[PDB]
From a paper:
As an iron storage and release self-assembling protein cage, wild-type Ftn (wt-Ftn) comprises 24 FTH1 subunits with 12 C2 axes20. With the ultimate objective to create a biocatalysis platform that could be expressed in vivo, we report the rational design of an artificial human ferritin heavy chain (FTH1)-based metalloprotein to achieve histidine-specific aza-Michael addition with α,β-unsaturated chemical moieties. Utilizing the large area the C2 interfaces cover altogether, mutated FTH1 subunits were designed to assemble only upon divalent copper binding at the C2 interfaces hosting their histidine mutations. To still allow these sites and/or structurally induced nearby residues to chelate Cu(II) for catalyzing histidine modifications while allowing the ferritin cage to reserve its self-assembling property, instead of modifying all of the above-mentioned four copper-chelating histidines, we attempted to replace only one (R63) or two (R63/E67), which are noncopper-chelating, with histidine analogs 1–3 (4-thiazolyl-l-alanine, 1; 2-(5-bromothienyl)-l-alanine (BtA), 2; 3-methyl-l-histidine (MeH), 3), separately, via genetic code expansion.
The cryo-EM structural models of Ftn-2X-2 and Ftn-2x-3 and these two Ftns with CuCl2 supplement were solved and revealed two detailed metal binding environments. Instate of binding metal, either Fe(II) or Cu(II), at the C2 interface of Ftn-2x-2, 63BtA, 67BtA, and H60 form an aromatic cluster of pi–pi interactions. Conversion rates (CVRs) carried out by Ftn-1x-3 and Ftn-2x-2 with 2 equiv of DEEM were 20% and 33%, respectively, making the latter more desirable for further characterization. For Ftn-2x-2, seven other α,β-unsaturated reagents were tested to modify insulin, yielding CVRs between 0 and 44%. To investigate Ftn-2x-2’s substrate scope as an aza-Michael ligase, we examined its catalytic activity alongside DEEM treatment on seven additional protein substrates that ranged in length from 10 to 607 residues: a luteinizing hormone-releasing hormone analog ([d-Ala6, N-Me-Leu7]-LH-RH), the small ubiquitin-related modifier 1 (SUMO1), lysozyme, human ubiquitin conjugating enzymes UBE2 V2 and UBE2N, superfolder green fluorescent protein (sfGFP), and bovine serum albumin (BSA).
Residue numbers in the entry:
A (entry chain V), B (entry chain A), C (entry chain D), D (entry chain F): 5 to 176
């Protein structure tokens, strides 16, 4: 119906809406993590800062998807942003592992979206995904994997000194 | 249980958690409005910009509340961020009226929170609310009322020229 | 025959030549529009400026396609640039609607070109189209749709005041 | 009797004098801690610097209270500044825990002062306490709690390496 809509399948529109909700959910998870590390009984300031930055970045990814939805003449349908799985993330290492799992889940969703766009012969949508989301996800996954490896090698979560020093030296 | 907790009632902690969720919900409503005005069949760029700025400000208010929760030794319990009431906000004037209603609802919640903090003799929480939330809410309500008045006087929503010119001159 | 030619199908070469001609035709249409709004009995300077800028941009798109043709070892075959459909474009709103229709036609041609390049397994040509043409077209279509929406809402073409104010505030 | 005195109860004046003495005592405790960490057999320079800064800040808080006493027409009655409980503070972690306990005691005194001022309907005194003392105390308590948490997690006081690294990385 939109005067600008061209080569934009309804399935693609629906998938974009689902991706918007997933990105908002990921941002909310990161927010929860960030303020977990701000707790007085956790007190890892750079973990909190790292996850807060991640949250803001995820928010921006969601917003970019909404912008695309409008650009292509699709209609944004928002849904509830579900609360994260955990209130207490239990350690820096556990939070990093959960973030890695989350980023891989988002990446899988993006790959499914790219598959759909390819099936619908929507080169603009494919190129948008590749340009703005896929390599960002690969880099994020690599960085989180590096963090997890380093934390495990340093002796986290059992060694509190490990998480303290990782907070200072890697995230600081 | 928190080593930093002092003169922080459990009722106040719960009310702060509810306020956090309300602020996140308000931010989400503003986001929905912003991207409604970004639609090709609405195309009011400065309305979109205004509501996007409002959304970011609300997000920051929520985050400040979470920071307080941690500062006082309370524990943040996040909840689902419900989707906004509307997908289609129908006009600049209607969006402004809905935003006014929303801001007054948030203000009423903040006033109830202040009443609770006064009843619990929590001067720090009272002062926090007064310093960071109450006057901001009064100013926001006044600004939205001004916008609604001007839009109505110009002939919105029936006159599209009114909303166009208000977009340019007041929000631009 | 070209020493540089590699994985460049003759069908792709022919389609590129057709695209070159289409881009030149679009530039010529925009030129006609621009100088229509420069007429003393139309006198919408920023409409003229907008369409002149569009014309120059289209010319540059054509030239970029010719550069690609040479880069890949294809041979440029120019054809007559047909005159635009209209000498008199009748209004700012009508010109914007015609420009929207034209941009969607160019976009459809580009999508067909991308389909051909995908069928011929020419990833370089696909990537060229995606990187330099597809998102530019989506943005142009969105912008024109916004202009059309705003002009219609303001009361164009009947209200001359609408086109005057749109000339000043949006295109100025 | 003072020409400037207005709505300043004698009970409030006495409580302000007691608060002045408490702030001076806290400054003296911090001074003792600071020079404990300057000992050659302790030798934690940034612990010493941190506690010296805390001492100076407490002194300034006391002085601000005296200024208020004069502003409101009360009369300053100084009392002996009692020596701190300990000469030897035994470790960085123990000093931080004692500082946390001290700050919470000062905060409790300030809250009692605010309760008194509210009971006497002295909004100026209430606002003074809220503006200059309450949030400062909350922040100080939160910071000390964070320090205590980090020191405990790193393995202090048993691990001298923990206190050394905390000295360098957090307090440095
Ligand atoms: Na993302
Ligand atoms: Na708010
Ligand atoms: Na073009
Ligand atoms: Na003090």
């Amino acid at each position: 119906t939109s005067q600008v809509r061209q080569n934009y399948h309804q399935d693609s529109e629906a998938a974009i809406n689902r991706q918007i909700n997933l990105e908002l959910y990921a941002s909310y998870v990161y927010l929860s993590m960030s303020y977990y590390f701000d707790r007085d009984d956790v007190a890892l300031k750079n973990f909190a800062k790292y996850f807060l930055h991640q949250s803001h970045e995820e928010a921006e990814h969601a917003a970019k998807l909404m912008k695309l939805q409008n650009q292509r003449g699709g209609r944004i349908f928002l849904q509830d942003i579900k609360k994260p799985d955990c209130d207490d993330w239990e350690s820096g290492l556990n939070a990093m592992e959960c973030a890695l799992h989350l980023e891989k889940n988002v990446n899988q969703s993006l790959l499914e979206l790219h598959k759909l766009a390819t099936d619908k012969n929507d080169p603009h949508l494919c190129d948008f995904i590749e340009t703005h989301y896929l390599n960002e996800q690969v880099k994020a996954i690599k960085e989180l994997g590096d963090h997890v490896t380093n934390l495990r090698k340093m002796g986290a979560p059992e060694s509190g000194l490990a998480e303290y020093l990782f907070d200072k030296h890697t995230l600081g």
